[PDB]
Structure 1
Amino acid sequence: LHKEPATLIKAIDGDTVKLMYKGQPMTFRLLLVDTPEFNEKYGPEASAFTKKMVENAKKIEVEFDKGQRTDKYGRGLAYIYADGKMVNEALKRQGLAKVAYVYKGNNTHEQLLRKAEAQAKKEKLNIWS
């Protein structure tokens, strides 16, 4: 697994972000993550979290896993890093996402993100409160 560069076009919600990738606008869905919808409990906190993290980054990198790169809606499937920090993980860590949509072949960071989740779940952060 390697990082590829991209530039923010637009924050969307807690687990989607519109990015410029290899010259094309592409909506990315975050691997292994499920944030609440913007109108559920902690949805706006999730959107705000991802938004701030992508908006402040000097460098946004896209990292595909070893499986499918595009979902059935045409969304890129990737781990996204904001100045070297993984948005996917930080959401788990902050208690603003649950680990979800784990398909074998696209799961390199499962343990890591479940670790973050475990610690968020320990502290009773946000959705675990």
Structure 2
Amino acid sequence: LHKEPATLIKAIDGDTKKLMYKGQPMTFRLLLVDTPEFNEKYGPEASAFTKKMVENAKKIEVEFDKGQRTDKYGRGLAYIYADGKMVNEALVRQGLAKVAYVYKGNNTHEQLLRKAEAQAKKEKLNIWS
């Protein structure tokens, strides 16, 4: 896989944001995770964690996987990096997302993310508390 440039347009919630990619505005949905909706427990915390991570970053990058690049709602499906740290992994490691929506052939980082989830769970963090 490879990282490609993007810039933040606006934070939306724990697992979606609006980025400019190849010069076009798109909503991206993070691969292999599920944050709580804003109206659910830990939803505001997840939203704030993602927002801080992407707004504070000097460099946002998108990494598509091997399969589908857009979902049925037209959202980009990617791993999103902030100054080289993966947002997807960071949410999982903090107990603010569950590993989820693991579809065959867009699951390159599945094992990395499940390792993070195990650690968050051992620590009883947030969703696992």
Offset of residue 7 of structure 1: 0.1
List, as ranges, runs of 4+ consecutive aligned residues in structure 1 with deviation greater than 2 Å: none
Query: Aligned partners of 1:104, 1:46: CA distance in 2, in Å?
Result: 26
Q: Deviations over 1:3-44 (max 9, x none)?
A: 000000000000001000000000000000100000000000
Query: Aligned partners of 2:113, 2:12: CA distance in 1, in Å?
Result: 21
Segments of 5+ residues of structure 2 without an aligned counterpart are none
Offset of residue 103 of structure 1: 0.4
Q: Deviations over 1:70-122 (max 9, x none)?
A: 00000000000000000000000000000000001000000000000000000
Relative to the length of structure 2, the TM-score reads 1.00
Relative to the length of structure 1, the TM-score reads 1.00
Query: Aligned partners of 1:44, 1:26: CA distance in 2, in Å?
Result: 22
Q: Deviations over 1:45-79 (max 9, x none)?
A: 00000000000000000000000000000000000
Query: Aligned partners of 1:93, 1:100: CA distance in 2, in Å?
Result: 14
% same residue:
98
Segments of 5+ residues of structure 1 without an aligned counterpart are none
When the two chains are superposed, the root-mean-square deviation of aligned CA atoms in Å is: 0.2
Identify the residue that residue 81 of structure 1 maps to in structure 2.
Answer: 81
Q: How many residues align?
A: 129
